[PDB]
PDB file of C-alpha atoms and ligand atoms in Angstrom:
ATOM      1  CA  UNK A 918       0.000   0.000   0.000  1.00 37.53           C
ATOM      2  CA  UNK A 919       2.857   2.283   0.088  1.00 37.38           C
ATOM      3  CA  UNK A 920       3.245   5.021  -2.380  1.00 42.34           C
ATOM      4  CA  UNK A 921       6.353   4.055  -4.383  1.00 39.73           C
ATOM      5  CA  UNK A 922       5.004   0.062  -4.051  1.00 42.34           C
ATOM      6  CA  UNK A 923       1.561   0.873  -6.029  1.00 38.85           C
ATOM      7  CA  UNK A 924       3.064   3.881  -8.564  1.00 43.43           C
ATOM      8  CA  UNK A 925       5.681   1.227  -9.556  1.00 41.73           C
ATOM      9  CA  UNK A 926       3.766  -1.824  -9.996  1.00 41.39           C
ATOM     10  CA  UNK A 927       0.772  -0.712 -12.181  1.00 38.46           C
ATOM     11  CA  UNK A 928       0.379   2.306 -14.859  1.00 38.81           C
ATOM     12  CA  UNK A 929      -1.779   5.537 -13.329  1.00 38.76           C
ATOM     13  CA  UNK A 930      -5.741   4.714 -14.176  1.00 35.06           C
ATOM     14  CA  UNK A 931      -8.793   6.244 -14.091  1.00 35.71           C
ATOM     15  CA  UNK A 932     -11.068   4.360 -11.538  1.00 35.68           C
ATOM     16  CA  UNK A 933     -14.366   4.634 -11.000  1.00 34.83           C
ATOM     17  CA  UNK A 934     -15.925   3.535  -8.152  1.00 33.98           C
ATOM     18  CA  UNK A 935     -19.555   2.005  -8.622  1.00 36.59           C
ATOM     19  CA  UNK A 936     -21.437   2.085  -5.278  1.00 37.92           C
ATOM     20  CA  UNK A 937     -25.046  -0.333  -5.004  1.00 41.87           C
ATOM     21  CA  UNK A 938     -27.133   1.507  -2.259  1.00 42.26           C
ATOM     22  CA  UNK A 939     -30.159  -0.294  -3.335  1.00 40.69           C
ATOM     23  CA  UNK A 940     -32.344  -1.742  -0.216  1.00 38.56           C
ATOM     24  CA  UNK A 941     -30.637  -5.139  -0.221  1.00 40.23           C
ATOM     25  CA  UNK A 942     -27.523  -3.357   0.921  1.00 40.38           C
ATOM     26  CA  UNK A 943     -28.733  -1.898   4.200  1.00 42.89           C
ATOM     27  CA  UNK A 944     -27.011  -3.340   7.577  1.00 42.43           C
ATOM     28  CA  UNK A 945     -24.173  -4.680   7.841  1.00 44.36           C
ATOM     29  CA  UNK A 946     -22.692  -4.936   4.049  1.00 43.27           C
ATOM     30  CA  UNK A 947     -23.006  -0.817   3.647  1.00 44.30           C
ATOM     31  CA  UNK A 948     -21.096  -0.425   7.020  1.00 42.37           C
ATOM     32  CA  UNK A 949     -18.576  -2.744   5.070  1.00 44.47           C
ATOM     33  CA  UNK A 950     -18.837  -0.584   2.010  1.00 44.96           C
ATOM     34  CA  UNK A 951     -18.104   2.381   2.978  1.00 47.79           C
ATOM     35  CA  UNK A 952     -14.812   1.388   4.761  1.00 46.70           C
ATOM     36  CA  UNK A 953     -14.309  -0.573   1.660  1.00 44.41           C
ATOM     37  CA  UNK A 954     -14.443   2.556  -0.425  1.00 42.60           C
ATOM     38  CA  UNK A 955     -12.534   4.775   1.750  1.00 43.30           C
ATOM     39  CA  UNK A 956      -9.703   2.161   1.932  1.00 45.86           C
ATOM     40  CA  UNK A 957      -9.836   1.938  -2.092  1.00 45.23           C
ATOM     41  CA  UNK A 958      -9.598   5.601  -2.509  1.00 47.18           C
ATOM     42  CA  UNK A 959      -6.120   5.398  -0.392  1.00 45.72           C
ATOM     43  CA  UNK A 960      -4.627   3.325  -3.040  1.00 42.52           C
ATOM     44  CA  UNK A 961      -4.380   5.896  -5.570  1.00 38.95           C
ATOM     45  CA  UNK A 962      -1.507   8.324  -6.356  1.00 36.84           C
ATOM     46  CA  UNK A 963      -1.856  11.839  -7.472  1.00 36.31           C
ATOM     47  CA  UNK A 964      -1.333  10.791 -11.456  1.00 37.85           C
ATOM     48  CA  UNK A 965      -4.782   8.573 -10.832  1.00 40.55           C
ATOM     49  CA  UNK A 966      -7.974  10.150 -11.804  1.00 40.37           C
ATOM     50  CA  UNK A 967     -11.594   8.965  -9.461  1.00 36.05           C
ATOM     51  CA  UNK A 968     -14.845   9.178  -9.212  1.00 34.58           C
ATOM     52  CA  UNK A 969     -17.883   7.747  -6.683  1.00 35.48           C
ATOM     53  CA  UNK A 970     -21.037   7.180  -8.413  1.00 35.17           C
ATOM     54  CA  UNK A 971     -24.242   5.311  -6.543  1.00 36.38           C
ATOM     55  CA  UNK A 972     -27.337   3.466  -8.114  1.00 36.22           C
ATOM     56  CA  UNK A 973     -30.163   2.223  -6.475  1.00 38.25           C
ATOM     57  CA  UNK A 974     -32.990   2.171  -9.815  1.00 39.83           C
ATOM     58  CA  UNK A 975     -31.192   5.584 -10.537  1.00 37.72           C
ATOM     59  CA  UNK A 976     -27.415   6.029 -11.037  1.00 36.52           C
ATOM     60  CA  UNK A 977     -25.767   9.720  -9.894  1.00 33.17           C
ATOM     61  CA  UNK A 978     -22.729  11.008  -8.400  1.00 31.16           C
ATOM     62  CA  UNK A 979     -22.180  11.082  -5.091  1.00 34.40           C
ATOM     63  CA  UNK A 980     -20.479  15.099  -4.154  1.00 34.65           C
ATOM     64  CA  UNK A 981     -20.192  17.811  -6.079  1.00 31.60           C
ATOM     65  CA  UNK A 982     -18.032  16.537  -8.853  1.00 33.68           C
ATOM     66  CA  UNK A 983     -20.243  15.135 -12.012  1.00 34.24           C
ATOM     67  CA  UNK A 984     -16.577  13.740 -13.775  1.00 29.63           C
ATOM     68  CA  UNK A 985     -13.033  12.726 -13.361  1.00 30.55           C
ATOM     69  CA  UNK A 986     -10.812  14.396 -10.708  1.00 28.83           C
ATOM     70  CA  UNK A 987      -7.195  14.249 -10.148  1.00 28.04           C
ATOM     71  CA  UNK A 988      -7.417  12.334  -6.921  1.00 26.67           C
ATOM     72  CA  UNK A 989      -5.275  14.487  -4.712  1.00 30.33           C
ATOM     73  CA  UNK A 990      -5.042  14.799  -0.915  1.00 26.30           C
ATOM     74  CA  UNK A 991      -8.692  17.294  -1.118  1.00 31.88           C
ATOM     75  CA  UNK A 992     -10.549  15.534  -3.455  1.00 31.17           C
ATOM     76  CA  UNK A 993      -9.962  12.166  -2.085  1.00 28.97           C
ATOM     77  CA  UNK A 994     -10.980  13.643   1.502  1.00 29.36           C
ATOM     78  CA  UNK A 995     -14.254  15.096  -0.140  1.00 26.42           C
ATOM     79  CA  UNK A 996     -15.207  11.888  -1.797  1.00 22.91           C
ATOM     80  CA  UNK A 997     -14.460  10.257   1.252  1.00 21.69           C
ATOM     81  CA  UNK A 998     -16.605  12.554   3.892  1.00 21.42           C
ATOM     82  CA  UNK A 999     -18.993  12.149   0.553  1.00 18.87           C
ATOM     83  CA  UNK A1000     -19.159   8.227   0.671  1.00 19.07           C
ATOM     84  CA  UNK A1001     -19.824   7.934   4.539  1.00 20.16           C
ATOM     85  CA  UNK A1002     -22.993   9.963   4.096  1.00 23.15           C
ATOM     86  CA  UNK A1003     -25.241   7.398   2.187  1.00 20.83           C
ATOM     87  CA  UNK A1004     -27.947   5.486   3.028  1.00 18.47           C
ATOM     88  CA  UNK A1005     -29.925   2.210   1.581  1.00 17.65           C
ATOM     89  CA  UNK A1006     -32.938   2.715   0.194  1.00 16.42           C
ATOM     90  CA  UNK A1007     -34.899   1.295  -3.492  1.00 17.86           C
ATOM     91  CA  UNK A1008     -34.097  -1.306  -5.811  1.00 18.06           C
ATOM     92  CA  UNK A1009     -31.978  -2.511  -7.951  1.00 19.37           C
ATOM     93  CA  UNK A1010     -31.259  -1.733 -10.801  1.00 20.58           C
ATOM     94  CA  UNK A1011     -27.502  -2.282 -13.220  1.00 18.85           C
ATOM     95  CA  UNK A1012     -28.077  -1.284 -16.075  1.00 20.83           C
ATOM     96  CA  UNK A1013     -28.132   2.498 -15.186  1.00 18.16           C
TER      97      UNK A1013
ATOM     98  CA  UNK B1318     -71.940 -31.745  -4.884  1.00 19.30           C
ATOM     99  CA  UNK B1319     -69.007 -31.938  -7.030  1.00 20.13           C
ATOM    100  CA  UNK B1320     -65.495 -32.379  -6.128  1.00 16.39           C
ATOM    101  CA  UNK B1321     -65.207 -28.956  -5.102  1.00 19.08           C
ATOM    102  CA  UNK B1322     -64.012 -29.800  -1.837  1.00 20.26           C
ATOM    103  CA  UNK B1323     -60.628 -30.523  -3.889  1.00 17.95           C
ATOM    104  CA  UNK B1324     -60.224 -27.677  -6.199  1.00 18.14           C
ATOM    105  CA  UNK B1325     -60.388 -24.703  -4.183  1.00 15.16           C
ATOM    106  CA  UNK B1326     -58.608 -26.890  -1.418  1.00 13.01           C
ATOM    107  CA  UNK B1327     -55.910 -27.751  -4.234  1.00 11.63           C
ATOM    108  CA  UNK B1328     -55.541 -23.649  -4.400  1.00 13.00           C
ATOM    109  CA  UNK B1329     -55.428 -22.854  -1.252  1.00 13.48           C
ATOM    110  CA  UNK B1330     -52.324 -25.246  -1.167  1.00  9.22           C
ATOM    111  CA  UNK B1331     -51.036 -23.922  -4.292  1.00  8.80           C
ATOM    112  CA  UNK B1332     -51.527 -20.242  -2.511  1.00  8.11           C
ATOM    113  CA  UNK B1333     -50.095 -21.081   0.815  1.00  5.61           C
ATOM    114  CA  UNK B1334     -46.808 -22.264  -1.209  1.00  7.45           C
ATOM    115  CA  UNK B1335     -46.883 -18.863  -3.084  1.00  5.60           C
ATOM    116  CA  UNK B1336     -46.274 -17.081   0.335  1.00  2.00           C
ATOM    117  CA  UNK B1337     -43.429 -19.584   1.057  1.00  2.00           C
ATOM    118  CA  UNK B1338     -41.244 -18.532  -1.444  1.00  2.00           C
ATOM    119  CA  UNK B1339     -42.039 -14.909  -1.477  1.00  2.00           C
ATOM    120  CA  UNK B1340     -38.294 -12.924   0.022  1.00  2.00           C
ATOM    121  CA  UNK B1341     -38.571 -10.093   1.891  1.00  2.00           C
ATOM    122  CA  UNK B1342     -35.911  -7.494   1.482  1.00  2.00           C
ATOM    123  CA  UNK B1343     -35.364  -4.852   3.471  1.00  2.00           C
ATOM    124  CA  UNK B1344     -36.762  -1.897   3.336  1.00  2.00           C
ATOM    125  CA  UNK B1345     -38.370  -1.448  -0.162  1.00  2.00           C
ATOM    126  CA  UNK B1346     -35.939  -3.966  -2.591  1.00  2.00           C
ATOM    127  CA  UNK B1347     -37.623  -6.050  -4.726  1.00  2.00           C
ATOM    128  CA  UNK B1348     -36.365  -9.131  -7.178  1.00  2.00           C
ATOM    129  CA  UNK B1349     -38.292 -10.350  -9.955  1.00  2.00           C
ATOM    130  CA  UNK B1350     -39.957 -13.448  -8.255  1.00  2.00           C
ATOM    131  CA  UNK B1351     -41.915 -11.160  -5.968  1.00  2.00           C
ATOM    132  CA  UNK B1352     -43.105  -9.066  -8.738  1.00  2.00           C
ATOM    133  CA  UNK B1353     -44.218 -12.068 -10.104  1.00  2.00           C
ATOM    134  CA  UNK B1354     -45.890 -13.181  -7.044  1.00  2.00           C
ATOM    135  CA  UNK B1355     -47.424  -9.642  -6.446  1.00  2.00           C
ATOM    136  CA  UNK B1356     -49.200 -10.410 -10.065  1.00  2.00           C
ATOM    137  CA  UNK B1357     -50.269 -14.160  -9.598  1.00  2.00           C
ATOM    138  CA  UNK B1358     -51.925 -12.548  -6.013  1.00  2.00           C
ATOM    139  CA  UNK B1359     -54.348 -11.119  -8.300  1.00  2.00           C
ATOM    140  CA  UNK B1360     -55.386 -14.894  -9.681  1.00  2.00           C
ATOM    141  CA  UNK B1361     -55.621 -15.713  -6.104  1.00  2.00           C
ATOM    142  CA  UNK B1362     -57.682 -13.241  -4.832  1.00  2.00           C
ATOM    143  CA  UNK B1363     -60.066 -13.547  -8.207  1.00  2.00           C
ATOM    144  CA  UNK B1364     -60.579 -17.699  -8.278  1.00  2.00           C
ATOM    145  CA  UNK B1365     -61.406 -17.002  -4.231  1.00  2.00           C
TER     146      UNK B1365
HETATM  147  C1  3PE C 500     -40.260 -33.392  10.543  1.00  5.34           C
HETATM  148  C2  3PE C 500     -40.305 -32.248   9.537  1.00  5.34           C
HETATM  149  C3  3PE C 500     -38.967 -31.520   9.475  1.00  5.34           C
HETATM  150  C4  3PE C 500     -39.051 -30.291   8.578  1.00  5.34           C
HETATM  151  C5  3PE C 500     -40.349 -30.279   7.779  1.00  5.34           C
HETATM  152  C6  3PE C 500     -40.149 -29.636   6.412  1.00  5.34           C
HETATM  153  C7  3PE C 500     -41.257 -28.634   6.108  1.00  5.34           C
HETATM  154  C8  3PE C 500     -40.908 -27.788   4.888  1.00  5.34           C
HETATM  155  C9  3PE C 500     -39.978 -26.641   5.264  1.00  5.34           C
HETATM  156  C10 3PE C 500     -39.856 -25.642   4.121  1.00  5.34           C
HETATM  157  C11 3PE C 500     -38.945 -26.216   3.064  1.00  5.34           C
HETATM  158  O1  3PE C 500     -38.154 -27.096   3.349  1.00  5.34           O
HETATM  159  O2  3PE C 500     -39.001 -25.728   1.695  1.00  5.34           O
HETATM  160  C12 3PE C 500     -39.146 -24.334   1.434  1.00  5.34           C
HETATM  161  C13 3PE C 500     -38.937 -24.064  -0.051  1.00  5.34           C
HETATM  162  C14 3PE C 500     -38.711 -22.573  -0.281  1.00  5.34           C
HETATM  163  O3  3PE C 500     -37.333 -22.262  -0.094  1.00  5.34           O
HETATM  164  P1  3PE C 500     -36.316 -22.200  -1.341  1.00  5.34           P
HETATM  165  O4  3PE C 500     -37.031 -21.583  -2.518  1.00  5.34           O
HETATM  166  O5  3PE C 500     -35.659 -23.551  -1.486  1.00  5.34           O
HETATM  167  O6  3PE C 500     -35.203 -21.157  -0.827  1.00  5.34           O
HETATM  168  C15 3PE C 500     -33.999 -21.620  -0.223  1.00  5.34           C
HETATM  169  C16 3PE C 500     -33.419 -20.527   0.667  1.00  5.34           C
HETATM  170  N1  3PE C 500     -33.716 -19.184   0.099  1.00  5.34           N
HETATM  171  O7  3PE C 500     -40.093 -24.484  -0.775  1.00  5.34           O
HETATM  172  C17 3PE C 500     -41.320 -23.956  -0.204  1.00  5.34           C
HETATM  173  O8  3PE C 500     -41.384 -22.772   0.074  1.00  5.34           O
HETATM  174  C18 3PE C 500     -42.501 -24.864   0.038  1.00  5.34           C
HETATM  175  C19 3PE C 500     -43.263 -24.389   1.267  1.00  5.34           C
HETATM  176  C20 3PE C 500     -44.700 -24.899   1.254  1.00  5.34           C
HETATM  177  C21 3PE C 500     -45.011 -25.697   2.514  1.00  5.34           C
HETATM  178  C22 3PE C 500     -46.303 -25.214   3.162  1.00  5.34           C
HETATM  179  C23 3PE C 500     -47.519 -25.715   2.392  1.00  5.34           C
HETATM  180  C24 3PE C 500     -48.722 -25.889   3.311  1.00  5.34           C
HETATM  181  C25 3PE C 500     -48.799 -27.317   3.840  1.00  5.34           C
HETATM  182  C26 3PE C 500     -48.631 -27.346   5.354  1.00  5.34           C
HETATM  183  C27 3PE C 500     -48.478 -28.774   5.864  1.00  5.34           C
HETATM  184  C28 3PE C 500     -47.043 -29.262   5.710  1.00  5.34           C
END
């Protein structure tokens, strides 16, 4: 996890995180998700480019960012502070 | 005078197995099976 391990083992990318918060997700596996994210996001360098998006029967972002963003020390901390606020609720639906 | 004493008895059965494998998920998820079994209520209530 350190920062000269993952910038010399894999070229930078452009992740995009995909968050369910349909119903099904409520409990125990979003508690699990949202560390999950915010443990993700830590794995990216400042050459990496991220985004959050959430679907439950409707897909949208999850801040104030609509796109790609450079994945620095201030965007990663808003996406983070962003990800902790969701909540379970709808159904399911991928193709969105 | 018929055997109705097995028909609507056979649907009762067939009814009381439709509520078996209707899954609940929590708080307003859905999978297709239960909107299947939301419809085939409809049969139920109708033939009753
Ligand atoms: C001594 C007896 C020991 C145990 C007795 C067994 C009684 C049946 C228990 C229910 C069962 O085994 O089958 C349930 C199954 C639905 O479950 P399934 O779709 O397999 O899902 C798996 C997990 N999600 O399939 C069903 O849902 C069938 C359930 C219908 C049974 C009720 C019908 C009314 C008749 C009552 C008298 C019996």
């Amino acid at each position: 996890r350190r920062p000269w391990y993952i910038q010399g083992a894999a070229s930078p990318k452009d992740m995009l995180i995909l968050v369910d918060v349909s119903g099904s997700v409520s409990g125990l596996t979003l508690k699990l998700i949202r560390t999950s994210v915010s443990e993700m996001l830590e794995t990216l360098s400042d050459d990496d480019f991220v985004n959050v998006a959430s679907f439950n029967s409707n897909a949208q972002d999850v801040s104030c960012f609509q796109h790609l963003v450079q994945a620095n020390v201030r965007n990663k901390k808003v996406l983070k502070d962003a990800v902790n606020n969701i909540t379970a609720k709808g159904i399911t639906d991928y193709k969105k | 005078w018929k055997p109705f004493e097995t028909i609507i008895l056979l649907t009762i059965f067939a009814n009381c197995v439709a509520l078996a494998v209707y899954l609940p998920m929590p708080e307003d998820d859905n999978n297709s099976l239960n909107l299947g079994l939301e419809k085939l209520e409809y049969f139920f209530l109708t033939v009753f």
